[PDB]
Amino acid sequence: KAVGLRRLGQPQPFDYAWLKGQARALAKAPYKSHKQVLPGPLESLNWDQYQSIRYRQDHALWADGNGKFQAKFFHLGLYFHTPVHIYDIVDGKAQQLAYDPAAFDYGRSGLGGKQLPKDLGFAGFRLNTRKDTDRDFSAFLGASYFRAVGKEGQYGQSARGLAIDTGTGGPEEFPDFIAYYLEQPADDSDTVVVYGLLDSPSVSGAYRFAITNGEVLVMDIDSALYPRKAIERLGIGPCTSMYQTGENDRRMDWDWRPEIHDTDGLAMWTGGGEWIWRPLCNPPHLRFNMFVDENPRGFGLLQRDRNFDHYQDDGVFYEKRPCLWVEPKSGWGKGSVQLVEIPTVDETFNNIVAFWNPQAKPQPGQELLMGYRLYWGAHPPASSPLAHCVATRTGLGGIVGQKRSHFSWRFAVDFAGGELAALAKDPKAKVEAVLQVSRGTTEIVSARPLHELKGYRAMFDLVPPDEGTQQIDIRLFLRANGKPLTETWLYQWTPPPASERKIY
Amino acid sequence: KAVGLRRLGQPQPFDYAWLKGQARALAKAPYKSHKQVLPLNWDQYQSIRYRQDHALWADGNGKFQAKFFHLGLYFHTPVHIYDIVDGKAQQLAYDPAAFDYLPKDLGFAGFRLNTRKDTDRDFSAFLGASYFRAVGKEGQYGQSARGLAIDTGTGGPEEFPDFIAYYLEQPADDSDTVVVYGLLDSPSVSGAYRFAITNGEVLVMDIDSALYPRKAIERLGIGPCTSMYQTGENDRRMDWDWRPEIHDTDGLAMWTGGGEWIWRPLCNPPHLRFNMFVDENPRGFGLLQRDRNFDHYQDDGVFYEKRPCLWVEPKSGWGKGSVQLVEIPTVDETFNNIVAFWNPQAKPQPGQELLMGYRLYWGAHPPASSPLAHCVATRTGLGGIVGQKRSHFSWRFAVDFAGGELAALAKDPKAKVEAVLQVSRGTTEIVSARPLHELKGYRAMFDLVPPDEGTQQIDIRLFLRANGKPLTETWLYQWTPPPASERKIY
Ligand SMILES: OC[C@H]1O[C@@H](O[C@H]2[C@H](O[C@H]3[C@H](O[C@H]4[C@H](O[C@H]5[C@H](O[C@H]6[C@H](O[C@H]7[C@H](O[C@H]8[C@H](O[C@H]9[C@H](O[C@H]%10[C@H](O[C@H]%11[C@H](O[C@H]%12[C@H](O[C@H]%13[C@H](O[C@H]%14[C@H](O[C@H]%15[C@H](O[C@H]%16[C@H](O[C@H]%17[C@H](O[C@H]%18[C@H](O[C@H]%19[C@H](O[C@H]%20[C@H](O[C@H]%21[C@H](O[C@@H]%22[C@@H](O)[C@H](O)[C@@H](CO)O[C@H]%22O)O[C@H](CO)[C@@H](O)[C@@H]%21O)O[C@H](CO)[C@@H](O)[C@@H]%20O)O[C@H](CO)[C@@H](O)[C@@H]%19O)O[C@H](CO)[C@@H](O)[C@@H]%18O)O[C@H](CO)[C@@H](O)[C@@H]%17O)O[C@H](CO)[C@@H](O)[C@@H]%16O)O[C@H](CO)[C@@H](O)[C@@H]%15O)O[C@H](CO)[C@@H](O)[C@@H]%14O)O[C@H](CO)[C@@H](O)[C@@H]%13O)O[C@H](CO)[C@@H](O)[C@@H]%12O)O[C@H](CO)[C@@H](O)[C@@H]%11O)O[C@H](CO)[C@@H](O)[C@@H]%10O)O[C@H](CO)[C@@H](O)[C@@H]9O)O[C@H](CO)[C@@H](O)[C@@H]8O)O[C@H](CO)[C@@H](O)[C@@H]7O)O[C@H](CO)[C@@H](O)[C@@H]6O)O[C@H](CO)[C@@H](O)[C@@H]5O)O[C@H](CO)[C@@H](O)[C@@H]4O)O[C@H](CO)[C@@H](O)[C@@H]3O)O[C@H](CO)[C@@H](O)[C@@H]2O)[C@H](O)[C@@H](O)[C@@H]1O
Ligand SMILES: OC[C@H]1O[C@@H](O[C@H]2[C@H](O[C@H]3[C@H](O[C@H]4[C@H](O[C@H]5[C@H](O[C@H]6[C@H](O[C@H]7[C@H](O[C@H]8[C@H](O[C@H]9[C@H](O[C@H]%10[C@H](O[C@@H]%11[C@@H](O)[C@H](O)[C@@H](CO)O[C@H]%11O)O[C@H](CO)[C@@H](O)[C@@H]%10O)O[C@H](CO)[C@@H](O)[C@@H]9O)O[C@H](CO)[C@@H](O)[C@@H]8O)O[C@H](CO)[C@@H](O)[C@@H]7O)O[C@H](CO)[C@@H](O)[C@@H]6O)O[C@H](CO)[C@@H](O)[C@@H]5O)O[C@H](CO)[C@@H](O)[C@@H]4O)O[C@H](CO)[C@@H](O)[C@@H]3O)O[C@H](CO)[C@@H](O)[C@@H]2O)[C@H](O)[C@@H](O)[C@@H]1O
Ligand SMILES: OC[C@H]1O[C@@H](O[C@H]2[C@H](O[C@H]3[C@H](O[C@H]4[C@H](O[C@H]5[C@H](O[C@H]6[C@H](O[C@H]7[C@H](O[C@H]8[C@H](O[C@H]9[C@H](O[C@@H]%10[C@@H](O)[C@H](O)[C@@H](CO)O[C@H]%10O)O[C@H](CO)[C@@H](O)[C@@H]9O)O[C@H](CO)[C@@H](O)[C@@H]8O)O[C@H](CO)[C@@H](O)[C@@H]7O)O[C@H](CO)[C@@H](O)[C@@H]6O)O[C@H](CO)[C@@H](O)[C@@H]5O)O[C@H](CO)[C@@H](O)[C@@H]4O)O[C@H](CO)[C@@H](O)[C@@H]3O)O[C@H](CO)[C@@H](O)[C@@H]2O)[C@H](O)[C@@H](O)[C@@H]1O
């Protein structure tokens, strides 16, 4: 039977307006690092020691009550040298939770009998239903990172509170959540509300996360930001994923597993009403791309291929990993969805980052309010009502069985859904591939039924305009009678250098 | 309505003994070339179409007919075609009335056979040198057979026999079989063949051959299967194409005289590889297209997943010899870069008569396979624990098996299944055998550390075992390790 948790200090009145006040005040002073040298035995644990530490079910927050949820806490150490102070809100008042050795099984860490302060803090927290106390439906841990899962329960990509100067070629600035306030839900509530205080060299913030667990998990998020400095590249709603290899891009096809990625595309629903699918790549050099928009309806990183046959990893279940969809609340005005793709040689590094960059540079003293909903699960809650891109495949161009007189690259793009089944069965149906390329030229263009999918396949060869490796953008959709039949496929290709072209 | 075909000369008595007689006399005399200067793009060649009004047997009441290929393009060796009726052969003339666009004795390039019900579908086609093809139910042409291979994969020049005449025996009206006789000639050898062809879901050819060496032969190949393997999970060295699997066949299957079932995955190696599997009284061998899932191939024009498996079953005990496999590097699917055949231990000698009979099966599945679990996938890549510094180069293999009693073992937490793994050189590490529930089978994984910096072929033998007995056919993989320069990049 669970016990009450050890506390620190007395309850203090708490609400979102109060937290926005703390964050604004925090931005009025220069940034001071929150990283600490931890007490001696804690400062240099190894992986094995750290991993053996376990938070005890009998000290899980709220598990002594009658509600549907509970929380457990991650211990500091190993990677986590920035204390996070955790508070419980009851009747409108926030009480800090003490670091309590009785709440941990220390395993092989050697931490028992050390004299660790009551104000040590934590590394983060995780939430669990009371019906299923070993399953984490969300986990907030490290910097401003957090993750959640839907029904399938397999962890994959991450979100963050905020991204700053990702992919600039210069150094990235990583904000931290330095405090979390967990609001005790009503006994019959399906929601857990968590508040977060964020600080970073450039900016402070106050965050409210209303987390509703479900088959697709939803978080209703409000953020109030208070810059301390001008910010070159602010990133709202950042999604953080990994793409090593797959049909979209076989450059790093060194593995026996054919698809290795936590997500395979960036999806966008534009203010103008367009649906876009942008297949993720693993490029040879860092690539930064922006998609200009105004009042965006949504963007996110999806794991659209959910067929185990294409992944084959019965250890980590890539095909079950969640989509993450960002849905702006209200109008965010002008800006761009931005995508950073970093080269990676393996699947241990998150080489994909996507976020929203406002047009206007934030300025010291200003308040910036940004709200959105995040959906985690097998499918985003919104998608194109037209046919979706269900596969992208590429390879060396040129008519098979003829001499090849020049370098080109071949693309095959498969669409299914909407009304393509009926069109594919109509021998008179005329479907037009619509192609626009940033540079270079297309040849051997076709759009034809793909009966095996009850869909359509577009194929084209792309001839780069020169011997250089400047990125080439291709926009493709299918159409009939004044209406698009598909969402828009937007691919960004880094041509090979002349030396590689010569081998071909 | 179809008309009778233009003839040439008068019917002469014909039987198999006569044909054997013509072949042996051909072989005793000096070889005379049959390539002729004929009295043209690949696209431009098909303007020529043999017409149905002139199709052989289309004016009768039987189940089958023949039409003929025109000499041209890749075909400059005339084939004389004959119709056998009541024990008598009569040559068919070259007739311009029979084509849609030249002497009566110009000859043809070969023939194709059709049911009367589907006169545009051909279920067999004999065309080019001694090559021929057939299809089963799915109708999609793929790998080829030949009458004979000579000096394939020697590092010297190959010699390619020609069928120089075919005698088509008019079937009885209710027969399900077409019998075709072939006269083969080649610098080294002449032959008389009999092909009993029985169309069906899996098409069967019952073949008898009688071979007369004109001179000693260095490498005789009997029952040759000729295929293509560009890229796929077995070997992604040439992964240039958007299509992930490109091959007419994915493995060599062998049923040995001792009763072993072997699956040898085909590769597209960087240099020619010649491999032999010593056997005695082989029970069968062939090239299979075992992966039949369109999803893995994606070509909705030529349907690699529907192409036929070719299985050879000797009608008798062929004694000692070897199944031989030749793999040639290719950068495209148009080159036939895979050849497998039986090579008898004994060197053929001038004056001798070699009688060899066998059955060929063309269709979706071989008519025989292991009753144990099959290898249903081979995948390979860079070895080493993922995301760790590597002290040494290694290559990782994942091999999936399904069938036999593996589904029951996979569900059974008490089940003790072990991978048994031998390599001809180097060492193996990080070896496992575990249920693959998504398949209801097992997966074996291992890493292989090549012994040195060089690229000498390594042979790997794998099977799964419980209580001392095999649970699977034998997986036999021949790996060419990458050179040092490639390892540095890894
Ligand atoms: O083929 C191949 C070739 O090719 C070429 O190229 C080309 C190309 O082609 C390609 C393709 O293309 C395509 C195209 O495309 C396009 C696209 O399209 C798209 C689409 O769209 C479209 C649309 O469409 C539509 C449709 O409509 C259409 C129609 O249709 C129809 C159909 O019809 C068809 C037909 O059908 C039929 C069939 O059957 C048949 C068959 O056939 C087949 C074939 O076969 C062939 C072959 O092949 C093969 C091969 O193999 C072979 C061989 O050969 C080889 C050689 O051999 C030799 C030997 O060799 C040896 C060696 O020796 C040597 C040496 O070596 C050495 C060694 O030794 C050593 O060791 C080493 C060391 O190291 O060294 C070395 O060196 O050397 C020396 C030197 O010195 C030498 O001398 C020597 O020789 O050795 C070795 C070792 O030992 C060995 O192993 C070897 O062997 O030798 C010997 C002795 O001497 C000799 O004799 C031999 O010869 O070799 C050479 C060299 O290398 C090579 O090269 C060769 O190759 O031979 C042998 C013997 O004889 C044999 O046996 C074998 O087999 O190969 C492979 C492997 O590798 C295999 O696999 C194969 O198979 O070949 C031959 C020869 O040539 C011939 O004859 C034959 O024929 O094939 C195919 C393929 O695969 C298949 O498929 C088939 O099947 O045949 C038979 C006979 O046999 C007969 O009988 C039968 O009949 O099929 C079916 C099924 O099965 C059936 O049923 C039928 O019947 O067909 C045809 C043909 O193909 C076609 O054409 C047609 O089309 O039909 C159906 C039913 O009925 C119907 O329904 C339909 O309708 O049609 C029309 C008319 O035409 C049209 O017009 C129309 O279009 O429709 C459908 C339904 O509805 C729908 O869906 C659709 O859509 O349309 C529209 C309009 O409207 C349009 O616009 C449009 O476009 O669509 C789709 C869907 O969606 C898609 O997918 C597609 O894509 O498009 C695009 C745009 O967008 C474009 O761009 C494109 O182009 O198309 C077209 C029409 O369009 C087509 O035509 C074409 O095709 O493609 C593919 C892929 O995918 C590929 O693959 C191909 O290639 O094309 C182009 C264009 O046109 C052109 O230009 C040209 O050219 C190449 O050139 C060549 O090369 C080859 O050959
Ligand atoms: O493999 C498996 C398979 O089989 C099959 O069956 C088959 C068979 O096989 C078998 C084998 O056989 C062997 C033999 O043995 C036997 C014997 O024989 C005999 C004969 O008789 C026969 C007949 O004949 C005929 C002929 O024809 C031939 C040819 O001729 C040519 C010529 O030359 C000649 C030679 O031959 C001789 O020898 C000599 C003498 O002096 O003379 C000469 O002249 O030349 C010309 C010019 O150049 C030409 O034109 C011709 O063609 O040759 C070939 C090659 O060598 C041979 O083969 C043949 O035979 O012709 C003649 C005329 O000249 C006539 O008259 C005769 O008649 O035929 C029949 C049918 O028609 C049959 O039936 C019979 O048999 O005779 C001869 C004489 O002439 C003698 O010499 C011989 O010896 O017989 C016996 C009794 O009957 C028996 O028993 C045996 O068997 O031998 C041969 C020779 O040496 C060889 O070659 C063969 O191979 O045997 C084995 C045992 O070991 C077995 O196992 C097998 O089976 O064969 C047959 C024949 O060819 C056929 O017909 C059949 O078909 C089956 O069917 C399946 O199923 C299986 O799988
Ligand atoms: O963004 C979308 C989501 O919005 C959520 O709703 C939010 C709401 O966002 C609005 C936004 O609100 C802005 C605000 O305009 C309000 C106006 O505010 C007056 C305020 O009245 C509020 C009250 O304020 C208390 C005050 O807290 C403020 C805090 O004070 C500091 C204190 O914390 C500190 O200790 C000391 C010492 O350092 O300094 C003080 O300055 O400072 C922060 C940061 O600046 C402010 O955000 C806090 O308001 O503290 C004093 C004590 O010091 C209290 O006496 C006072 O009550 O708080 C109430 C909740 O407790 C709240 O309901 C009241 O609105 O009062 C101050 C004076 O005290 C006055 O100057 C503000 O103008 O209120 C009117 C209602 O009459 C609203 O119509 C108006 O929108 O202005 C502040 C200051 O500039 C902004 O920071 C704030 O963003 O306005 C947007 C329109 O432009 C609107 O679109 C947003 O929805 O903000 C409130 C307040 O922060 C939140 O409580 C609320 O949750 C929705 O719930 C989501 O669904 C949306 O997605």
Numbering used by the authors:
A (entry chain A): 30 to 533
B (entry chain B): 30 to 68, 74 to 135, 145 to 533
Structure paper excerpt:
In this report, we discovered that XccOpgD, a GH186 homologue from X. campestris pv. campestris, alone converts linear β-1,2-glucan into CβG16α specifically. CβG16α is classified into osmo-regulated periplasmic glucans (OPGs). CβG16α is vital for the pathogenicity toward model plants, Arabidopsis thaliana and Nicotiana benthamiana, despite the nonproduction of CβG16α not affecting the fertility of X. campestris pv. campestris.(3) In detail, CβG16α suppresses the expression of pathogenesis-related (PR) proteins and callose accumulation in plants. Structural analysis of XccOpgD revealed an unprecedented reaction mechanism, anomer-inverting transglycosylation, providing the new concept of the reaction mechanisms among GH enzymes.
The D379N mutant was used to determine a Michaelis complex structure of XccOpgD because D379 is conserved in GH186 and equivalent to the general acid of EcOpgD.12 The complex structure was obtained as a dimer. Three glucan chains were observed in this structure. Two glucans have DPs of 11 and 10 and bind to sites distal from the catalytic pocket of XccOpgD. In the catalytic pockets of the dimer, the electron density of a linear β-1,2-glucan with DP22 was clearly observed only in Chain A (top), probably because the closure motion of the cleft around α-Helix 3 is inhibited by crystal packing in Chain B, implying that the closure motion of the region is needed for substrate recognition. In XccOpgD, the substrate is also observed from subsites −16 to −8. Subsite −16 is located near subsite −1, which appears to be suitable for cyclization. This is consistent with the compound produced by XccOpgD being α-1,6-cyclized β-1,2-glucohexadecaose. Consistently, electron densities at subsites +1 to +6 are obviously observed in the complex structure. In contrast, in XccOpgD, W76 in α-Helix 3 is likely to be important because this residue forms a stacking interaction with the Glc moiety at subsite −16, and this is consistent with the W76A mutant displaying no cyclization activity (<0.1% specific activity compared with wild-type XccOpgD). In XccOpgD, the 6-hydroxy group of the Glc moiety at subsite −16 is located near the anomeric carbon of the Glc moiety at subsite −1.
